[PDB]
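Retro notes
What went well: the complex prediction finally ran end to end.
Inputs used:
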Amino acid sequence: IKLYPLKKLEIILEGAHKEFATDLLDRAGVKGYTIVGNLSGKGSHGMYALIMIIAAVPEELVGPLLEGFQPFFEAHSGVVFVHDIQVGRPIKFR
Amino acid sequence: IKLYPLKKLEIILEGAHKEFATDLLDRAGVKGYTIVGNLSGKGSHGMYEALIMIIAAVPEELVGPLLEGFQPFFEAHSGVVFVHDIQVGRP
Amino acid sequence: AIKLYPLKKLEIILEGAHKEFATDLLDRAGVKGYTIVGNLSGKGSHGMYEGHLMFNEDDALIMIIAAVPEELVGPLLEGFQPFFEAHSGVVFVHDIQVGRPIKFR
Ligand SMILES: Nc1ncnc2c1ncn2[C@@H]1O[C@H](COP(=O)(O)O)[C@@H](O)[C@H]1O
Ligand SMILES: Nc1ncnc2c1ncn2[C@@H]1O[C@H](COP(=O)(O)O)[C@@H](O)[C@H]1O
Ligand SMILES: Nc1ncnc2c1ncn2[C@@H]1O[C@H](COP(=O)(O)O)[C@@H](O)[C@H]1O
Ligand SMILES: [Cl-]
């Protein structure tokens, strides 16, 4: 048929660390991302400028990408949600 | 890194009830949530051009108790709940 | 206690000027509701889209979220394909669960 599997990350972190995260995605070969701005939240270290970066990636990049974010996330607020998704043309993503 | 299974709720409802919702999350033991504002949308009850969406990763055991706590509210107020399967990293 | 049923959830990301095109497609197919996240930014094959820089707010990127029965995913993607051959954007299909199928089907 017509659908092909991919992975989708939801990366939630402080707005001030946007450049870090996008440069990390770019580096890794991720071909695109979408940024939801002006979010609020609650977590360990209190409540809430938070943003959410959405990135559709081939499964081959999840491992590498989480390794990249781990060091950041040991010293900073935030989280990464990995989702399974399907797309009609995975071309655009690899 | 090791990947572990979790559930992710997306809870869309009128911002006037944000407090009710976050409180409910807090008392059920939800360790965190993220909120998206200034939303617009279409539902059985017409157009919205406000709305908010609450994102909450939680362990599977919490989903059932959470839906039951929201049931009274959603059987008398606009809004929807979407349950996703997600994975999260743990090193 | 609350039973859960499968659906699909689409995330459709495109420039705000085409919002009516995309929602019309949803209405036509029988989609019963949708939620729109506005004022987004993004990097794409074409370049960068920065919501905050647009003079008309309605022109910025948006993301339409639509929970739909799996039967409507084909008819919808067939409609969005030619649009996305000619215009910026992407569609992500998710599996989700909901407690009230009647609200969506
Ligand atoms: N379980 C969760 N669900 C949704 N968002 C979360 C969750 N945990 C953390 N976040 C987001 O990440 C931010 C920081 O969390 P923390 O790293 O725990 O301080 C929170 O303010 C939320 O916006
Ligand atoms: N199928 C759907 N997909 C995404 N969002 C929805 C859907 N149905 C309802 N919503 C959201 O929930 C709000 C309230 O809808 P309702 O509960 O039908 O009045 C709408 O304005 C939308 O933002
Ligand atoms: N891999 C991806 N993950 C998340 N969002 C994307 C991705 N590729 C493209 N987008 C979004 O789609 C917009 C247009 O993409 P394009 O059609 O390649 O210009 C971008 O500005 C992003 O907001
Ligand atoms: Cl619902």
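What we learned: The interface with chain C takes residues 2-3, 8, 22, 31-38, 54, 56, 83-88, 92 of chain A (CB under 8 Å).
What to try next: split runs per interface for comparison.
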